[PDB]
Amino acid sequence: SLVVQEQGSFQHILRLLNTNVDGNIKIVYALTTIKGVGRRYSNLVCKKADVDLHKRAGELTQEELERIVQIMQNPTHYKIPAWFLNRQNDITDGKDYHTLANNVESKLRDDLERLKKIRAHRGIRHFWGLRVRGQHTKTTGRRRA
Template structure:
C-alpha cells in the first residue's frame, strides 16, 4: 500500500496548533565592543591578546598556565567569560598583584612553579623575565657545581635521558661547526 494517497481528511483533533516560541529569538554571536576595549594589553612585561577570554589570555605570560590563571581570576572576582580587552585598569592591577604574590592570596604552595628555592628556600611563582632568569641561574649553578645535568648542558647534548646514537645528529654537527669559528 505504499504510494496510496488517503482521500479521507484528518479529524480536527489530530492537528497540532502552531505556537509562538516561548523565548525571544537571539542574535547569532553578535558582540558589541565597549568604548574602552583594548586589543592588546601589556601585563607583566608581556603582550596579552585582548580578544581572548581572560583565563586563556593570561596563559600568554610565561610561567602562568591554565590552572594558575583560573585561580587568579577567581581570587580577583573576574568573570571567566569576560574578554581580556574588557578588563579595567583596577582589575589588571589586581591580577598583577595576585600573580606576583600568590601566597598572600591563599593560593596553595603546591601549585607554584618555584618551590623551596636553592638560594633562599622560599616558595614563589616565577613568571615572564623572572622565570627565564631563574632557569638561567639554575643551569649556571649546575655547571659550576659540575652536576651531571650541568655537564650535559655544557656539552650541548640531550639532558633528560633521550637516546643520542641515531637521533639529533645534524643539530649537534651544526652547533660544533659554528663553535669552531
C-alpha cells in the same frame, strides 16, 4: 549567554608584566602569553581576582587587571596552595616562589649555571648541548642545535 553591548570602553591589546596581551581573546588564555603562567595558573588567579572568566581580555576594568597582576606575584598570600608553584623550596632562601615573565628566563639560567659551576654531571651534560634526563642519544634528536 546574553547579547552584550559596550561603547568605546574596551581597547584591543594591553601591556602588563613587561609583555603584550591580545584583547579579543578570552582573558584566561590571554594571560598565558606571559612567561610562567600556564592555563591552570591563569585559571586560578582570575578565579581569585573575582573576574567573569566569560569575559575577554578586552573588557576587564583597569582595576580588575591590577588585582590580577597583584595575586600573580604573591601567590602564597592570596591563598594559592604552594604545590601549585613553579619553584617551591628555592635552594637558597628556601622560600616558595612563583617566578613570572622575563624572570623565568633568568632563573633557568641561574640553576643551569649552579650545576655547571659545581661540575655536576647534569651540568657538564648541559654545557655539551645534549639531553640530560638520560634519554638514549643514538637515534633521536638529530636536526637540533
